[PDB]
Amino acid sequence: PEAWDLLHRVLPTFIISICFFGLLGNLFVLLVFLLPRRQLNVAEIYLANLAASDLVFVLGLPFWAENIWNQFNWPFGALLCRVINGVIKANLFISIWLVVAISQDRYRVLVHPMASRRQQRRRQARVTCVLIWVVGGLLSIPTFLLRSIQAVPDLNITACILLLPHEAWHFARIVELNILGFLLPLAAIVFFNYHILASLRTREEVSRTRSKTTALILTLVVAFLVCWAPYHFFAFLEFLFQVQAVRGCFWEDFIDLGLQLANFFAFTNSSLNPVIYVFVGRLFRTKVWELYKQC
């Protein structure tokens, strides 16, 4: 179909652009934090971990751009086929669960400002972020194992694909990818940011007697849904097609195209998260200004 020809023509440019902005943003974050090497805030621990996760996340995109150029005829070795898609599923989990960890800490820090004064947060922060990097590594092992180069006879290409050994792995893939990757952290993010926003509404209500933060807190949930809901929606339609709960030429054309567009669109998260979680803050902007004052 024409749409695939168009996709092969244009989608590498979109991928390369999202890669470029992702590298630029996350490198800028990492620099402005780590250039004054010796110390960081507890918030900056999570934010630096997040910027690193989104950096390594977009680091795999140029290979996929140069795979869609060459028309999905995977140019690289079978090992790189395992490694790239492994680090891309790992950093999906690590980035998403780090924005969970941020929203949790931010809840503890803004809804309980005194108890989070007494609690030893910085230890829990280091432990949590490195535990997330570990568990996100481990949850990627299934991708390292099952991703393999195979011929696709309908297309006359060798493509880097999941050689899923049994149909049970479709249920395992969809349960882990939609429920753990999108659905559980969405629910946690919405819980924490609701309790935050309700507390800041109460603070504003009392303060007025004698809205940027609400805009940012809603922008977190909006950006998360905009990035991740389209892909996990198409992934759900794919799983339904593997169940043949949906069936026909329309569905297979729609799903297969949408998975590509939505998947590479989801990498916009690596570009938006530096903006929303870092660049908008007055503190960060002063930290830029004062490290421009020490060129």
Binding site: K89, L155, A159, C160, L162, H170, L259, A266
Partner: peptide, 9 residues
Amino acid sequence: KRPPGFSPF
């Protein structure tokens, strides 16, 4: 139908 896994995730 393209195989599963045809895309990055």
